[PDB]
């Protein structure tokens, strides 16, 4: 029900929770409240989702919570345990993508050669 | 209420107190007897949305965990300079090959 | 022990091999364009 | 794996060297062409 989406790009992570959109939400992890206090500028919460930069393997890599005001922290029924080997300027590519791009490159090169040879007439 | 997760050697376990009812995710290598289930290799990048029922002090509660590991192994660190140079040299080389085949055809 | 940059080297060696193939084909093609064979 | 990195670096140097050789060959043939 309304799963979390940890979308990441390079060293930065975008983490959003669609459990209850359209309300103030402070997400606490490991028994302390980490919301919007401008703390360290690393947690950027714009409207609902809070982003982290300079992610570390040890700290801030654990549980997570979503709930609005009024309700207590010990009320929410969801918990995200994410461990992220956060890496700088990198992505995941299987062999299939490289094979596809190589085949495409060879094909387009051959097509261009044939086109030029045809134009040579 | 949380779902404890610990890695003994290279397996991520899920046991909270009792059997965990998988609802969507990864249900692969499991030593399911009554309590602990794991998902084999850590490097395998395991995910999934889980569940477990009331524990010793907490009856009839239901809290869910969501493992979203990212231990990338097929995972490449592209250097912008290197990839840019490679692609530009590749396009230059293919244009040069076209020029050569044109020069030969005549 | 990390496998982060070895994939980068294996990806760039493919680019180097494809460049070598293209340039060798080009050079052979022009050399034969000249004369003799 | 260490052996993969070993072989990969050796082969990268080898292929760069081969491309470098083909470049001077191209230079010679194009000098012949223009003349």
């Amino acid at each position: 029900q309304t799963p979390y989406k940890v979308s990441i790009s390079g060293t930065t992570v975008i983490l959003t929770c669609p459990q209850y959109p359209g309300s103030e939400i402070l997400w606490q992890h490991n028994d302390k409240n980490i919301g919007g206090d401008e703390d360290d500028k690393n947690i950027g919460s714009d409207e609902d989702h809070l982003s982290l930069k300079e992610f570390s393997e040890l700290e801030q890599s654990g549980y997570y919570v979503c709930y609005p005001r009024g309700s207590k922290p010990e009320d929410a029924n969801f918990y995200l345990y994410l461990r992220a080997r956060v890496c700088e300027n990198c992505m995941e590519m299987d062999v299939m993508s490289v094979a596809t791009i190589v085949i495409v490159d060879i094909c387009i090169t051959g097509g261009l050669l044939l086109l030029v040879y045809y134009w040579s007439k | 209420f949380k779902i404890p997760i610990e890695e003994l050697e290279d397996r991520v376990f899920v046991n909270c107190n009792t059997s965990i009812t998988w609802v969507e995710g990864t249900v692969g290598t499991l030593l399911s007897d009554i309590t602990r289930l794991d998902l084999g290799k850590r490097i395998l990048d395991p995910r999934g949305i889980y569940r477990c029922n009331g524990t010793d002090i907490y009856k009839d509660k239901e809290s869910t965990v969501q493992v979203h590991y990212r231990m990338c192994q097929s995972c490449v660190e592209l250097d912008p300079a290197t990839v840019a140079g490679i692609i530009v040299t590749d396009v230059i080389a293919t244009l040069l090959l076209a020029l050569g085949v044109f020069c030969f055809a005549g | 022990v990390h496998t982060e940059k070895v994939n980068m080297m294996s990806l760039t060696v493919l680019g180097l091999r494809i460049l070598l193939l293209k340039v060798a084909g080009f050079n052979l093609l022009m050399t034969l364009r000249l004369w003799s064979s | 794996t260490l052996l993969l990195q070993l072989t990969n670096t050796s082969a990268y140097y080898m292929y760069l060297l081969l491309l470098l050789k083909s470049v001077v060959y191209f230079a010679i043939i194009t000098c012949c062409l223009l003349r």
């Binding site: 590519m93 299987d94 062999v95 490289v98 094979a99 190589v102 085949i103 060879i106 | 192994q73 097929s74 | 496998t3 070895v6 994939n7 294996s10 990806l11 493919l14 091999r17 494809i18 193939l21 | 794996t1 993969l4 072989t7 990969n8």
Partner: peptide, 30 residues
Amino acid sequence: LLDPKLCYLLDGILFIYGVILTALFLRVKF
């Protein structure tokens, strides 16, 4: 890792290139 698979893929492509052209050469010489 992907190096072995990539090397064998490129080798397969080059072998296909070799085979088609030797077939064409055998056609012309015959």
